[PDB]
Design a protein around this nucleic acid. Structure first.
Lengths: 78, 76, 85, 205
RNA sequence: AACUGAAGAGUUUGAUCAUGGCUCAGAUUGAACGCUGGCGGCAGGCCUAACACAUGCAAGUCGAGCGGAUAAAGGGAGCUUGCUCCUGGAUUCAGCGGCGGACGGGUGAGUAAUGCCUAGGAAUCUGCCUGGUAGUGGGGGAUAACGUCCGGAAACGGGCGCUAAUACCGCAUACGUCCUGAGGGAGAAAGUGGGGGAUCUUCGGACCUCACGCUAUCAGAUGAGCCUAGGUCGGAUUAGCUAGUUGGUGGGGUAAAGGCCUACCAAGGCGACGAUCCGUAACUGGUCUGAGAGGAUGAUCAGUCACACUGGAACUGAGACACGGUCCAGACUCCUACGGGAGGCAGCAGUGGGGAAUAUUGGACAAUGGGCGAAAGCCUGAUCCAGCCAUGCCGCGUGUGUGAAGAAGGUCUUCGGAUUGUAAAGCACUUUAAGUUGGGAGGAAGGGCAGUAAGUUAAUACCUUGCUGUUUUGACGUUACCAACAGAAUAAGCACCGGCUAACUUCGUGCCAGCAGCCGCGGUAAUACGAAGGGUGCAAGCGUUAAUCGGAAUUACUGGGCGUAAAGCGCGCGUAGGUGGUUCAGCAAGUUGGAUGUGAAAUCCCCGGGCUCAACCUGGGAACUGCAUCCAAAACUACUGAG
């Protein structure tokens, strides 16, 4: 299956996720089909937490992309 | 995609051989050399002569080392 | 080791022995047709061809031979019966 | 690592005032700045041509208190920016926080301003900064923390502002002790003894 | 958003100009060693023996697939405090099954080629996902468990007897599937669970509905297999190499084109544009130097390939010729009742060995992810976190002010003094980090339970979904961070000082010991050896060694030379190849301009944004010089036609 899930970038104790669409049998930090947004939990000041783009998420979700548990709510809270 | 060369061989059976010249440039000295190319175009009717000027195109492989075919004979 | 690889080990010969019976049966009903061609037999091969088409295709949807392999014998063996006319 | 030791002795080799001692008592009375230091303080002659460029670079590097690992770091940010690396090298040494505390006049020496930053007594945007490398911007309201507004180190130093004047890119308020860094300096308030065409040429070869 | 840097010196000579070597100043490393040693962030840590391995752990999960045996609560009775039996039954897991172990983690042995990059295309496949479409009718024979017997030192093996399934196999039907020449012919399936109006009935059940699962098939994404063209290290003191070899035909074989394979036919194929052979090496996006052109190099991170003690081989399956699978042969350890067996850390730790040299037998599933079940849950040595090591980059401390009797004390001296030096001492203040005490976020999204509203329906029963209410969850952790208390207390070395090259004099030593990157010093006055004062460079580091690129216009495309410094074949003729006088005309292969597809993300660069700053993290752009397909222009080169 293909799936929409979260990567992990940044230092220790300061994460920064990436909404990628990947084949399911890959690594976390490995290859991907494309990337559509990010998610910053520790965003402070001028930083933006959610930055999903609704165009490609309209495209992939109509072709059987299967989201994760956190991405079940982040697309919902837009 | 369509190439052009001249025939050098008629020895095999339903199989012709072309020379495709080419001017590549040298990567560091800025000069256009000539370096050749020699294919095995699939002849079809055993009717080309040594010294022609023909036209080839690419198909699926027919034997091994023979994937190009013959479009048409341009000039003698 | 595991107590789960030793289960997939026992579960391999129970299918290896089972698939071999379903696989060799196909080949006996095909060699009956080919040995009947070589003796220039028109009606002997025609009877063997009739009762071997259902054996091949019923062994195709079980998943023993692939469905494009069963599509290949039926085309070629018809091409040798029309060459006896 | 700072420099802890004698401080007339640095002013005594380069042969200038250099503004290192604190009070307005006297130059060349605490110091005796007539000679090169050491035993052979009388013999002189023919500074080498390489030795002139190193003497100019070491002069600018001892006014402010940097070390060379930091100083080459400022030199990279000079050559990154657009145009006139000599002026840009100075304006990254003017915007540093231990300089601006000295320009406002919250200390006698420049090394006193380093200690007032280091003990969390200085704020920048309303929040505490204790780093003597903080590059301030245009319009940062440097103020003094209320727990130490009664220190005589700050009160006495404002009478030492009389022999200095205002540098006309700051403004200081002698009641609430809240300076305002107005804008960047120009290449007119800096003294002509420093040379922006010897330090740049030293870091080529 | 677009964007700039190029240094020289010493050494051949009585001296000079030139040619030409050598050596130094720079920035860098998975670095090692010597001296010295406060702190915290963010990083990295077997480059050598792919050399053997003690002991722990690294892939299992489903009782809403089916047997079986454990049988609670409770319903109890009875008998006299406890047992008896009964009744239901919640739990629980050895077995059959469905899935998954082909993903994730590790290492660089092999391979000089279509392996890997870039551009293309045609002959195929694809479990789980999405969109559809047509179904989900009936029937039979076995089998483990469990019995029981027999054999084995074990590791286990054998026999007879019994039972079930979504296990397995016929039969029935079928497009919108396969083959066929139209004509015609061939092929499937599995049920469990929540409910329930009516009705048949032991609501054993049928029944209706819902969720789930299964069977054909078309399309979409995703992954995979093939073919062409080009590029891809040194050696010419390696020049010929090859009979499935190179084509054709007939037949097989594989998901799929092909000498892939075979039977005859034919005598071809490649090669100085370097075949063949030898020697070494995993490639790539990138890193390190450079002004640039280039030159070396492929640690960590990412993509691709290749292996899993050595050599083979297939099965199972959607997809392996399979790191914790099977069979065989070999080598090597271990067990044994001597008959036979067992095992594979190039998974995480760890031991031995090698070596100039490289870390703890940690903590957890809370986070992000995977596998199974979607019902919660369960597994996870990949992940997220701690421990060790100045192994690197970036930041902060080791106090601040005043103070000349210019004190002792030291070294030198023309004996007058000079210098160490406001430096100390003395006096007045300051308390970050470290220490101590109190306080204290953010990483948490959910799940349970209850309620309610929507749509499913025959039945707002169940269930799905909004929402409400209530309750529960963190390895890190004594969290970052904040406040208070103590007091200047808790905290500086290392090389060098004749010239290149910043910085100097006395004392020992006398061709001895010794020094050294090059010039070269030392024979009794040494600014070069050994010390002492003084001084200069750098700092929590400083030095040497090893190794690349610069400087080297010293392999010169950008950017050199050949009368005498090294360098014009003894002279001809000439094949491949390189270059082409002059007018028109055509053409568009080069060439210029433009458009589209591509050039993975990271890295570098530019403008911003977050951590008290910076390193670090991160948003938007440019760039990736390329290759391909189209459109136009026609000066010059090419090709063509005429002079």
């Amino acid at each position: 299956m293909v799936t929409i899930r979260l990567a992990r970038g940044g230092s220790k104790k300061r994460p920064f996720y990436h909404l990628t669409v990947t084949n399911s049998r890959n690594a976390r930090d490995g290859r991907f089909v494309e990337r559509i947004g990010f998610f910053n939990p520790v965003a402070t000041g001028g930083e933006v937490r959610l930055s999903v783009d609704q165009e490609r998420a309209t495209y992939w979700l109509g072709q059987g992309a299967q989201p994760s548990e956190r991405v079940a709510q982040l697309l919902k809270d837009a | 995609r369509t190439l052009t060369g001249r025939v050098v061989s008629d020895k095999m059976d339903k199989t012709v051989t072309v020379l495709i010249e080419r001017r590549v440039k040298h990567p560091i000295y800025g000069k256009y050399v000539k370096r050749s190319t020699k294919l095995h175009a699939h002849d079809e009717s055993n009717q080309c002569r040594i010294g022609d000027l023909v036209t080839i195109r690419e198909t699926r492989p027919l034997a091994k080392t023979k994937a190009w075919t013959l479009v048409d004979i341009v000039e003698r | 080791n595991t107590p789960s690889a030793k289960k997939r080990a026992k579960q391999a010969e129970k299918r290896r022995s089972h698939n071999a019976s379903l696989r060799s049966m196909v080949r006996t009903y095909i060699k009956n047709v080919v040995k009947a061609i070589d003796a220039k037999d028109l009606e002997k091969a025609q009877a063997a061809f009739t009762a071997a088409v259902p054996v091949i295709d019923r062994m195709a949807d079980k998943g023993i031979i692939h469905k494009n392999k069963a599509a290949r014998h039926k085309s070629r063996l018809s091409g040798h019966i029309k060459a006896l006319s | 690592a700072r420099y802890i030791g004698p401080k007339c002795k640095l002013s005594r080799r380069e042969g200038t005032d250099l503004f290192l001692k604190s009070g307005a008592r006297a130059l060349d009375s605490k110091c005796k700045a007539e000679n090169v230091p050491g035993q052979h303080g009388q013999r002189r002659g023919r500074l080498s041509d390489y030795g002139l460029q190193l003497r100019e670079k070491q002069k600018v590097r001892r006014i402010y208190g940097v070390l060379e690992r930091q100083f080459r770091g400022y030199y990279q940010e000079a050559s990154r920016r657009k145009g006139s690396t000599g002026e840009n090298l100075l304006q990254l040494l003017e915007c540093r926080l231990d300089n601006v505390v000295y320009r406002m006049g919250f200390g006698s020496t420049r090394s006193e301003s380093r200690q007032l930053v280091s003990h969390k007594a200085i704020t920048v945007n309303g929040q505490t900064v204790n780093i003597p490398s903080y590059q301030v911007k245009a319009g940062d309201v440097v103020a003094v923390r209320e727990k130490s507004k009664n220190q005589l180190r700050i009160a006495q130093a404002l009478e030492l502002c009389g022999q200095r004047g205002r540098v006309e890119w700051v403004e200081v308020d002698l009641d609430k002790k809240a300076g305002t860094f107005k804008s960047a300096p120009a290449r007119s308030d800096l003294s002509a003894d420093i040379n922006e065409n010897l330090i740049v040429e030293l870091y080529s070869k």
